[PDB]
């Protein structure tokens, strides 16, 4: 397992890198989902009703004896609001019972080491071409997955040349799928400054020595993320593993520094070790057919019996010896 | 073809029932001239037809005399479609051939 590093020509193999040990991590899909749930509510902004809402009356219960329910009635006279019910959640213009507060816990804590494992497993999902095409990316034209582009990516100044560069990497069908997928959102979210939805396309991971922010950010279907700070919102957007990721050579060679190699600490991340699985081999249910296990087994009972009957004519017919006396 | 040429008329007297609960899949018939239980054994398994008209169009609801009922020659019959309680008191015609419980 060695990956090619392509020029902006898109066909010439410049280097042949080994796969970083992050991209060989066996993926715990539950752990990446558990971390994505808490990471998604990091920018969760508070909402609440007004603390006065519904409570701005001098309302009192009229008591019993007036052939009316005991709910607080709006005081005064001469208006249509007068005498109407107030203060209750069942009342019109009443305070909602259990009003929403801003002291709600909007953010969720997740252990930093467990979040780092899920970032590692979401990174390994991008290195699996069955996963990347399973989440909707059109990766037929793409050379490798992981597609690594050289650090001469920073010499692209205009986004016309950047769109042409992604075109000769076989991402033309991928970008066109995202650009045409732009449609208006289907709910009341279109009122709340979330009018347009489009699909998630290519993610480009770069480092500070290959900064391609200006020339690439405007292409529809291209997200850019620095390698020093990978969120799960980019790596598995929508809790669905296998984001199509194009690497620069600077970001790809830093993966063995951010997460380290197997059995070793990470150099750039203090006190991080890549996760250890509970199994060694892949597809451990296939170990059942190994001859080490297969010799160990007792012989199972494969006798297929006839279905029993309870009716007295059939079970006399099974042992037809009643009439012999 | 008259039904009374070859078939013995029997009056649909009741469904098979308790004092209150009625099981309408089995219809009780009183065959004419049959007055005892052993006399009605001659008609066990015999086919029976109930002839009626729907919008002036003649229909035959066919059945089988399934079991005896009582000591007085009343027999229980099961038909293709259950007899309506409107037809209680009307006649159904008991055939002189045996039919089977599967094949009416």
């Amino acid at each position: 397992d060695t990956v090619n590093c392509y020029g902006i020509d898109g066909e010439t193999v410049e280097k042949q890198l080994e796969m970083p040990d992050v991209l060989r991590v066996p993926i715990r899909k539950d752990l990446v989902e558990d971390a994505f749930r808490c990471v998604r509510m990091d920018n969760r902004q508070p909402y609440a009703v007004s603390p006065n809402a519904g409570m701005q009356h001098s309302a009192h219960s009229w008591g019993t004896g007036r052939a009316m329910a005991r709910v607080p009635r709006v005081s005064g006279s001469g208006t249509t609001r007068s005498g109407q019910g107030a203060f209750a959640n069942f009342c019109r213009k009443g305070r909602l019972a259990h009003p929403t507060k801003v002291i709600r816990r909007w953010q969720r804590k997740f252990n930093l080491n467990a979040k780092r494992h899920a970032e590692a497993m979401a990174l390994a999902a991008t290195a699996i071409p069955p996963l990347v095409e399973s989440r909707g990316h059109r990766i037929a034209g793409v050379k490798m997955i992981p597609l690594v582009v050289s650090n001469s990516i920073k010499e692209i100044k205009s986004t016309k040349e950047a769109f042409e560069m992604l075109k000769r990497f076989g991402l033309a069908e991928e970008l066109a799928r995202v650009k045409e997928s732009k449609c208006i959102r289907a709910g009341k979210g279109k009122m709340r400054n979330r009018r347009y939805v489009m699909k998630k396309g290519l993610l480009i991971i770069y480092d500070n020595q290959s900064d391609i922010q200006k020339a690439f950010r405007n292409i529809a279907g291209v997200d850019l993320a620095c390698v020093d700070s990978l969120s799960l919102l980019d790596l598995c957007p929508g809790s669905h593993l296998g984001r199509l990721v194009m690497w620069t050579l600077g970001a790809f060679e830093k993966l063995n520094e951010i997460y380290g190699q197997y059995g070793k600490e990470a150099p750039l991340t203090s006190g991080y070790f890549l996760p250890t699985n509970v199994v060694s081999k892949d597809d451990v249910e296939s170990l059942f057919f190994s001859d080490e296990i297969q010799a160990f087994l007792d012989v199972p009972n494969l006798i297929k019996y006839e279905k029993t009957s309870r009716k007295p004519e059939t079970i006399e017919s099974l042992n037809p010896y009643l009439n012999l006396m | 073809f008259d039904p009374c040429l070859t078939a013995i008329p029997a009056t649909f007297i009741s469904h098979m029932r308790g004092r209150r609960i009625v099981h309408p899949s089995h219809s009780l018939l009183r065959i004419e001239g049959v007055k005892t239980r052993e006399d009605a054994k001659f008609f066990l398994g015999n086919g029976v037809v109930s002839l009626y008209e729907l919008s002036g169009k003649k229909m035959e609801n066919r059945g089988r005399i399934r079991r005896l009922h009582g000591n007085s020659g009343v027999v229980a019959a099961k038909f293709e479609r259950n007899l309506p309680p409107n037809k209680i008191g009307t006649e159904v015609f008991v055939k002189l051939y045996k039919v089977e419980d599967d094949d009416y």
């Binding site: 009972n301 494969l302 079970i315 006399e316 006396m325 | -």
Partner: protein
């Protein structure tokens, strides 16, 4: 990889076909043996009954009175339903395996079992079956209480709490009694002559889920038969209920 899965599945395919042909040839050889062993034991039933009649008529040839040894088992039918049963009587009907009415069992003719039958005698009809009632009850409504054995070569590992009610085949009998009994008549013989294998033979029989009797119980079935009911010691006339209950 994918090879070792497929070479496993055709290895179990051969092993399934091989041991199923072996199981069928076991069934045919057992049924061929069973047809012999019924005729041998029925002759032993006739010889045992003829010896008692010859013992009885020789005693009345002299002045004497001969009653034989009373049978090694009772046949017990649950008459009353499961409602309104006090906790002692409800427990005894559980240990007799009589959990519904119109259920029938064999219990041993013991002194402890006779005291158990006496305490629930307002709920049961019990008596003495002869060999014809014994054989009719087992051949017409006889099922086996069989524990599942998941391994073919190891009959020692099995499941405790789950017992299947299956047909009383020869192979079910041959598996329970480890080759000692292998036919239905040979199971009757342990019931009839009360051998050491009685407790194993009787418990191997599932309780006889009989029908309610033809022509009814003929009255008020809950009271004793000494008062006109159907509930108590039907000393040797217990076949007058049970033969009507089988079909």
């Amino acid at each position: 990889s994918y090879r070792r899965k497929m070479e496993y599945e055709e290895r179990m395919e051969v092993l399934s076909r091989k041991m199923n042909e072996e199981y069928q040839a076991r069934r045919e050889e057992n049924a061929r043996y069973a047809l012999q062993r019924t005729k041998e034991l029925i002759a032993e039933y006739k010889e045992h009954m003829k010896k008692e009649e010859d013992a009885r008529r020789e005693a009345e040839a002299r002045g004497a009175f001969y009653v034989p040894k009373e049978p090694e088992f009772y046949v017990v039918v649950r008459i009353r339903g499961i409602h309104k049963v006090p906790p002692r009587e409800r427990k005894i009907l559980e240990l007799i395996r009589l959990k519904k009415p119109n259920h029938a069992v064999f219990v041993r003719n013991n002194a402890p079992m006779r005291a158990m039958l006496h305490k629930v005698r307002a709920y049961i009809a019990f008596g003495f079956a002869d060999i014809h009632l014994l054989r009719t009850l087992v051949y017409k409504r006889g099922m086996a209480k069989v524990s599942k054995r998941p391994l073919a070569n190891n009959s020692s590992v099995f499941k405790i709490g789950q017992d299947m009610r299956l047909n009383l085949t020869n192979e079910a009998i041959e598996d329970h009694f480890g080759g000692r009994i292998r036919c239905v008549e040979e199971l009757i013989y342990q019931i009839y002559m009360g051998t050491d294998l009685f407790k194993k033979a009787n418990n191997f029989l599932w309780p006889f889920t009989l029908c309610s009797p033809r022509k009814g119980f003929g009255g008020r079935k809950a009271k004793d038969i000494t008062q006109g009911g159907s509930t108590g010691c039907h000393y040797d006339k217990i076949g007058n209920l049970i033969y009507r209950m089988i079909e």
